[PDB]
Design a protein around this ligand. Structure first.
Ligand code: NAG
Ligand code: NAG
Ligand code: NAG
Ligand code: NAG
Ligand code: NAG
Ligand code: NAG
Ligand code: NAG
Ligand code: NAG
Ligand code: NAG
Ligand code: NAG
Ligand code: NAG
Ligand code: NAG
Ligand code: NAG
Ligand code: NAG
Ligand code: NAG
Ligand code: NAG
Lengths: 163, 420, 198
């Protein structure tokens, strides 16, 4: 049976009459080599999704490349739970999420990557005999947009298919 | 057997008779609502073909189907991120509880974060996170907000709720002691503040006992988080079905394509590859359509959860049964692996007693009606009380108003009205 | 980037239509994407087979488009139901629900027509310019406890007043804004004071 992937040492112990091991939902997991009868775990070599983090060509042409769920030791370089990031400099600060990368990591424009800030931290002056009462107010107008309908489309299949 | 529809009882209905409660119960009700599901991305080129340039070349003649499926799955993933953001990022500031906990006897240590710091999570949320158990082009995109950030959002919501009431939901947080916040909430359900202040210790003890009962139910009783478990089980079943369909003959000679390439010349093989491509594409479209429907259902549930957070955590809701069985007082949100959990604190009347009533009181040829409440009689004397609690007070011109005579009101009862 | 929802809906519909038109020009394994050339080049059996394959592919594309339109229509129907509810409960009345019609205490709302939707301008009341005060659950006077009617007891440091919750309007504590419901031994946090009798 022809497959593709990397081979590694496996701690699993097979049975003498058993050649290869299949993972749940019928996918190959390990095959014992017939020459020395050694259990070898076979897992497919790393594949992932390539994503581009950009502030837009109007601002700058500089971009950062994200490889999703790929350990980039085999491909600035930063390692996140979402994968690997190249072209962004990691910083120890925290701002509002500009470009959502994932796993609590966001990028912003050089290209920097950081941990998103959930908001301004403030402690309410709580006391058992103290209140805050407003002496003034503001009138705020907020705009809310709600779709109500789309374009009505009809298809005449008999002529649409072949005319 | 035949279903028993419920306990059958006849209400003792009669005119000029009422049942008025003389006691209260503080009830904490747990509601579970999914907020999001696992974000899965499927590469159709790798799923259908699996590293075969000729299979891909045959697939190009099928048009742009893979682009549509990838766009639909990406839309589902960004939709899940959007639902989580709408439910949990209601506030824009991270409020913090004071170092000293003096809330008039109320205990919130089981819902607030603890010094042990298990990724900055409370004990109830620890129980919930421990009660849920979780290669061919399949990838799992991690959520934008991690568990610790969602826990921080919930902790901020708790801090704002217990230190400022509903004021922080309408703007800047206005600090207020928990006693006057509870008094305001009792005024919200039509019960005067003195009812709270007379039995502050009893209300605090009932609330603490209710939190302990929720703790015990989460620790012992199973399948409490069955909705989230059903969601993750459906997702896992869908992925498992997709993987199983990948291993399908689909009316060919074999379910593996490399053997087709090795056991046929390229011209004959193309036909079998085309047949497998058609079958796997059909399976993938079926899975994507089912995922879109499930995502719409999860989005509806999360919109409901955000609405419940908005007018039940950030304020008091007058809607019946929206946020608990009974008169709603407040609510507490807690995180969950793919959803939210609301602990609704509600007011339940109890220990009702029978009383004799009258629509109005006839005094000096005039009809008197109570400003708020009801006229009741214990058999000999007539008093005026409130609807949701038994606080009998003598009939006075201050809490009654005159709007006519006694010749038109049906059920009028003669009595004297004290003038102070 | 303020009318993003309506523009996104229009873009999704246009993209779906364009994708359908492009998918019409797909071979689906046939010799050619145009039927007249297929009829001209091939004998009737083989031409019929290739045409049938093209029919299956194009009908499959139409089924996918129709299913996507049904799902989008369900989403738009849910949004329109929400918009009708918002119009009913915020334009035709005042809504007590928190954050249903804008942040803050809702006052009124005004609808505005949009090409494929609606725009709600929510007028709300937002408190501001906060100040600290010292409170008490009740006022102890003549061995009795007085609780506010629709206000709260506050103190600026030396004197006690009754003010409404959402605005600072201090008033003299009298018997016309307080009610007596007991004595001074059960209330936790009560403070001794005098209550004016007009
Ligand atoms: C199945 C079998 O016969 N395996 C043997 C292996 O044990 C031996 O080590 C090798 C030569 O060293 O020749 C082969
Ligand atoms: C196989 O089972 C036996 C007993 O059931 C156990 O002792 C042994 O450790 C198992 N094998 C492995 C590799 O764990
Ligand atoms: C965006 O484009 C406008 C118009 O060309 C330009 O004035 C502006 O500088 C651009 N923005 C940035 C950040 O460069
Ligand atoms: C990536 O591979 C290196 C090499 O051993 C390893 O040290 C590192 O932990 C890996 N990163 C992971 C597993 O996230
Ligand atoms: C960020 O903080 C860590 C903490 O040890 C430190 O090792 C690292 O050098 C810091 N990075 C920068 C850019 O300051
Ligand atoms: C309240 O705010 C307005 C502007 O927001 C300001 O003009 C006014 O002086 C403030 N104070 C009072 C007491 O109205
Ligand atoms: C009194 O109340 C009880 C329950 O609260 C009810 O069952 C009964 O019918 C009432 N009336 C009487 C005893 O006349
Ligand atoms: C009300 O019920 C509580 C227990 O729930 C009890 O301790 C208390 O004595 C009751 N009060 C009255 C007036 O029955
Ligand atoms: C609150 O509950 C916790 C755990 O149940 C307990 O350790 C703590 O002492 C309680 N606090 C008060 C004030 O009773
Ligand atoms: C009704 O209540 C009054 C005072 O609360 C009491 O004097 C009277 O005896 C009561 N009557 C009955 C029948 O319990
Ligand atoms: C209640 O109804 C009875 C007849 O069922 C009638 O005799 C009585 O006068 C009524 N009382 C009132 C207060 O309406
Ligand atoms: C109430 O009193 C008036 C006169 O004092 C009398 O005419 C009327 O019959 C009385 N009504 C009842 C129900 O006793
Ligand atoms: C209110 O805030 C000010 C400013 O920090 C502080 O000095 C004061 O003690 C606080 N409390 C009262 C009751 O004024
Ligand atoms: C508090 O209010 C009283 C009454 O208006 C006033 O006389 C006094 O100056 C105010 N300020 C302080 C610090 O007491
Ligand atoms: C409020 O808290 C302070 C310090 O924690 C305490 O001295 C005081 O007695 C408390 N007052 C009430 C009414 O709980
Ligand atoms: C209030 O006055 C009473 C007597 O009039 C006294 O017993 C009590 O201690 C006083 N309370 C305070 C807080 O001064």
């Amino acid at each position: 049976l022809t497959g593709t992937g990397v081979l590694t040492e496996s701690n699993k112990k097979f049975l003498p009459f058993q050649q290869f091991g299949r993972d749940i939902a019928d996918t190959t997991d390990a095959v014992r080599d017939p020459q020395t009868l050694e259990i070898l775990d076979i897992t497919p070599c790393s594949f992932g999704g390539v994503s581009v983090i950009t502030p837009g060509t109007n601002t700058s042409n500089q971009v950062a490349v994200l490889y999703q769920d790929v350990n980039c030791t085999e491909v600035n370089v930063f390692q996140t739970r979402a994968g690997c990031l190249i072209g962004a400099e990691h910083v120890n600060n925290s701002y509002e999420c500009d470009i959502p990368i994932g796993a609590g990591i966001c990028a912003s424009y050089s290209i920097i990557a950081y941990t998103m800030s959930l908001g301004a931290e403030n402690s309410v002056a709580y006391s058992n005999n103290s209140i805050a009462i407003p002496t003034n107010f503001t009138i705020s107008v907020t705009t809310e947009i709600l779709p109500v309908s789309m374009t009505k489309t009809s298809v005449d299949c008999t002529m649409y298919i072949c005319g | 057997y035949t279903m028993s529809l419920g306990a059958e009882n006849s209400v003792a209905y009669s005119n000029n008779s009422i049942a008025i409660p003389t006691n209260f119960t503080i009830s904490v009700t747990t509601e579970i609502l999914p907020v999001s599901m696992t974000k899965t991305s499927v590469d159709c080129t790798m799923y259908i073909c699996g590293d075969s340039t000729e299979c891909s070349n045959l697939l190009l003649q099928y048009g742009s189907f893979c682009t549509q499926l990838n766009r639909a799955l990406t839309g589902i993933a960004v939709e899940q991120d959007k639902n989580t953001q709408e439910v949990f990022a209601q506030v824009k500031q991270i409020y913090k509880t004071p170092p000293i906990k003096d809330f008039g006897g109320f205990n919130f240590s089981q819902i607030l974060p603890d010094p042990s710091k298990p990724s900055k999570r409370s004990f109830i949320e620890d129980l919930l996170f421990n009660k849920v158990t979780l290669f061919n082009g399949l990838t799992v995109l991690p959520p934008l907000l991690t568990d610790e950030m969602i826990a921080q959002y919930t902790s901020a919501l708790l801090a704002g709720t217990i230190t400022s009431g509903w004021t922080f939901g309408a703007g800047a947080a206005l600090q207020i002691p928990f006693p006057m916040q509870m008094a305001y909430r009792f005024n919200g359900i039509g019960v005067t503040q003195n009812v709270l202040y007379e039995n502050q210790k009893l209300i605090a003890n009932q609330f603490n006992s209710a939190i302990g009962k929720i703790q015990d139910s989460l620790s012992s009783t199973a399948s409490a988080l069955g909705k989230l478990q059903d969601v993750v089980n459906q997702n896992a079943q869908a992925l498992n079905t997709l993987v199983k369909q990948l291993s399908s003959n689909f009316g060919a000679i074999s379910s593996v394509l490399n053997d087709i390439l090795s056991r046929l010349d390229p011209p004959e093989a193309e036909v079998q590859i085309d047949r497998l491509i058609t079958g796997r594409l059909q399976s993938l479209q079926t899975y994507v359509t089912q995922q879109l429907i499930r995502a719409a259902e999860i989005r509806a549930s999360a919109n409901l959860a955000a609405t419940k957070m908005s007018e039940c955590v950030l304020g008091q809701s007058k809607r019946v049964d929206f946020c608990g069985k009974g008169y709603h007082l407040m609510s507490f949100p807690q995180s969950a692996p793919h959803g939210v959990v609301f602990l609704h604190v509600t007011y339940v009347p109890a220990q009702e007693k029978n009383f004799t009533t009258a629509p109005a009181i006839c005094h000096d040829g005039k009809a008197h009606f109570p400003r708020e409440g009801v006229f009741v009689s214990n058999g000999t004397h007539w008093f005026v009380t409130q609807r949701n609690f038994y606080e009998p007070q003598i009939i006075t011109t201050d809490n009654t108003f005159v709007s006519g005579n006694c010749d038109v009101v049906i059920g009028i009862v003669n009595n004297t009205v004290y003038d102070p």
